[PDB]
């Protein structure tokens, strides 16, 4: 028998569903989010990290003129300084008084930290929706993990589950995303070769193993001090270090519909948005015929304690007269009231105790135990105030 | 000086562009498309290949009843056959005449071929457009490789190039693609765990290294022959082998706009579709002032040979009177006629020979050599035929 219901896409909220197969005793199934997943297809554009300035020993050409050549290196800087007369510990390095030149050379590269401390720029497109789930089935908790596309059929204990399709297709993941460790950010990052100094992408490496990198940081070589061998220079602070403090809160904190954000792989979990249809093909063996189930008569209900809140603040004592011993399903016939118990064991001329949740101060509700209904009258009192902390 | 022009997105067609900086001698640049790459971001869903039927030695329980257990393996089949009496070379395998059972066991896995022969199912989204090309600049051919987004600035010989954005955002790739060696196919492939028997995806492996696989192929175990130890069975042919012959022509052959399709990485090259804007920031040094360039007078033009075709079927002899020796740019002032030569050397009271292309039978056109225009009258004859085989 195929049971079809729709629950809101909210994690941590147990929902009760009444399965009524004609000629068979009612069945109450408790369902609670399993952990849906929206995993987008990623295409790595580049990685960014803290940059590092490669300066070799300067070429001090004694009695001659050094020549600068155009080298295809990031932020390559070359300058030949005339009229130099450098000194070392034991005197002048050059034989000539005049006509000595110093060739100052420098270029920019990935820091030693780039393997450990880095942010990845990804192109995110067409996310694959997947669904799992649980279910209080036959007095036991079962877990169902399925794609929420309304096609992926998952069978657990002969019960076939079809989850979705999701009412909302929204994805807290734009076309361009940035990943740093366990945090994901929606960012229209600059493309490769377009990074700005002191900003995210001042240094860009296509892959973390890449030998050649793009760099746009303001490296300018200066004339060395009189009689001194050194390479003085002026150079915008790390864009990655700047982004680390300027990034703000990640998608885990900013995303709508109560989305949980995870990495390795990058995915949106339990989106707090829209609803989720559930299809359960319950096998014939799970059902008990009305004749094979206990028959209940002379039913009465009393509410000795009630507090209208988000949790089960209500207590109800139901007296009954059962034809035989067996298990009966417990369900509220009023949508404004929900019962914690899904199934209770009946004996004969005995009583049952149930836990209920309602927002109503004056709660009048019907409880169906097996195939018989009983009216419950409840005067519910305020908790810590209207608003409630449970769904 | 920024020169801005627009060329059709067609590879192998040389285009002539006239750069006219006020107060500077005209400059003719020949441009020919080098490559335009559209690389989509890929997310691997699964791989498929030829399947292989794992059948271990059957459990022949002599004087007892064997028991089948539910094993989580693809297409797992188990059957216990009663009343068996199997024989080996030296007689009966069992001591008992009756009450012997044979447990036949089977499951389905990836073939040994799966590492070599396989198709990959990818989720393709938001393609990154990249560009380069051939420019006849200062009598030399220069190659510019740039992303056709209208942002990526590439500088070659102090000339800054900005290619795009593309007039057409057409791809040839859909949301779901299938890759087999050097061939790409647009296919709405079945999701993981939804593959049909004898069709693409009858066997599905999330990764080529994956131990567990999905299989939906009709494996049914049969009762063994009298006194025979064997595992007879009935079983849809390989879906991958079927797809290999049913796939049809790949995207390289079917894609519009003359798209070339390459793999490793999957990309669309030279999409025959729309036009491409080109921005060239030509440096000051490349230009020659009108006063510094030769002055041409007493110009005459004669066409001794002409054939109206896709190639340079026209010949023109231009007589001139130059003030001094130097290089002059050659350009057609009529859009219906195009000249092969971009630059020629002038001496004085001499003549020049140029090659031209036109579709006109009666071609009347103006040729600008340096800063002076000359009228050319041409009677062009039919080629081989209509329609042309060059752009």
UniProtKB/TrEMBL annotation, chains A, B:
GO CC, one annotated term: host cell endoplasmic reticulum
Predominant cellular place of this UniProt entry's protein: host cell
Keyword annotations of the record: Capsid protein, Cleavage on pair of basic residues, Disulfide bond, Fusion of virus membrane with host endosomal membrane, Fusion of virus membrane with host membrane, Glycoprotein, Host cell membrane, Host cytoplasm, Host endoplasmic reticulum, Host Golgi apparatus, Host membrane, Host nucleus, Host-virus interaction, Hydrolase, Ion channel, Ion transport, Lipoprotein, Membrane, Palmitate, Protease, RNA-binding, Serine protease, T=4 icosahedral capsid protein, Transmembrane, Transmembrane helix, Transport, Viral attachment to host cell, Viral attachment to host entry receptor, Viral ion channel, Viral penetration into host cytoplasm, Virion, Virus entry into host cell
Disulphide linkage map: 49-114, 62-94, 63-96, 68-78, 259-271, 301-376, 306-380, 328-370
GO process terms (BP): entry receptor-mediated virion attachment to host cell; fusion of virus membrane with host endosome membrane; monoatomic ion transmembrane transport; proteolysis; symbiont entry into host cell
Assembly and oligomerization: Oligomer. Interacts with spike glycoprotein E1. Interacts with spike glycoprotein E2. The precursor of protein E3/E2 and E1 form a heterodimer shortly after synthesis.
The name this protein goes by in its record: Structural polyprotein
């Amino acid at each position: 028998y195929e049971h079809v219901t729709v629950i809101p896409n909210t994690v941590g909220v147990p929902y009760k569903t009444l399965v009524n197969r004609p000629g068979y005793s009612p069945m109450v199934l408790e369902m609670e989010l399993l952990s849906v997943t929206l995993e987008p297809t990623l295409s790595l554009d580049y990685i960014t990290c803290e940059y590092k300035t490669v300066i070799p020993s300067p070429y001090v050409k004694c009695c001659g003129t050094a020549e600068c050549k155009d080298k295809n290196l990031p932020d390559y800087s070359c300058k030949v300084f005339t009229g130099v007369y450098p000194f070392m510990w034991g005197g002048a390095y050059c034989f000539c008084d005049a006509e000595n030149t110093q060739l100052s050379e420098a270029h920019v590269e990935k820091s030693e930290s780039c393997k450990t401390e880095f942010a990845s720029a990804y192109r995110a497109h067409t996310a694959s929706a997947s669904a799992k789930l649980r279910v209080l089935y036959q007095g036991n908790n079962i877990t169902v993990t399925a794609y929420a596309n309304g096609d992926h059929a998952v069978t657990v204990k002969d019960a076939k589950f079809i989850v979705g399709p999701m009412s909302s297709a929204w994805t807290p993941f734009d076309n361009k995303i940035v990943v740093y460790k366990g945090d994901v950010y929606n960012m229209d990052y600059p493309p490769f070769g377009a990074g700005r100094p002191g900003q995210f992408g001042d240094i860009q490496s296509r892959t973390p193993e890449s030998k050649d990198v793009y760099a746009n940081t303001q490296l300018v070589l200066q004339r060395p001090a009189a009689g001194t061998v050194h390479v003085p220079y002026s150079q915008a602070p790390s864009g990655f270090k700047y982004w680390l403090k300027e990034r703000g809160a990640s998608l885990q904190h900013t995303a709508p519909f109560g989305c949980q954000i995870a990495t390795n792989p990058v995915r949106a979990v339990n989106c707090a948005v829209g609803n989720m249809p559930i299809s359960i093909d319950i096998p014939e063996a799970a059902f008990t015929r009305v004749v094979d189930a206990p028959s209940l008569t002379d039913m009465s209900c009393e509410v000795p304690a009630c507090t209208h809140s988000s949790d089960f603040g209500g207590v109800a004592i139901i007296k009954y007269a059962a034809s035989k011993k067996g298990k009966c399903a417990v369900h509220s016939m009023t949508n404004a009231v929900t019962i914690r118990e899904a199934e209770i064991e009946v004996e004969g001329n005995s009583q049952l105790q149930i836990s209920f949740s309602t927002a109503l101060a004056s709660a009048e509700f019907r409880v169906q135990v097996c195939s018989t209904q009983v009216h419950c009258a409840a005067e519910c009192h305020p908790p810590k105030d209207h608003i409630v902390n449970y769904p």
